[PDB]
Design a protein around this ligand. Structure first.
Ligand SMILES: [Cl-]
Length: 82
């Protein structure tokens, strides 16, 4: 199976915590399967980010990593990683 998943931010998120990840609408985020497994997301729950809650991820526009709310993003599908 796929090493990761892509999401697209739909709504701006301003960092609240040191480890938060800033979002602007249209930002593509990559989340690794290892990271969802590690949070105990059950197989295929990646398709409902509103249910995962907060996720760690790479924001491709900023190049930063950190935590962001799944309710601010839509699932795009599976990807290869760097
Ligand atoms: Cl801050």
């Amino acid at each position: 199976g796929p090493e990761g998943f892509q999401y697209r931010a739909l709504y701006p998120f301003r960092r609240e915590r040191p480890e938060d990840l800033e979002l602007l609408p249209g930002d593509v985020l990559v989340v690794s399967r290892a990271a969802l497994q590690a949070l105990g997301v059950a197989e295929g729950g990646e398709r409902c980010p509103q249910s995962v809650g907060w996720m760690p991820g790479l924001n491709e526009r900023t190049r930063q990593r950190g935590d962001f709310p799944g309710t601010y993003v839509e699932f795009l599908g599976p990807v290869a990683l760097a």
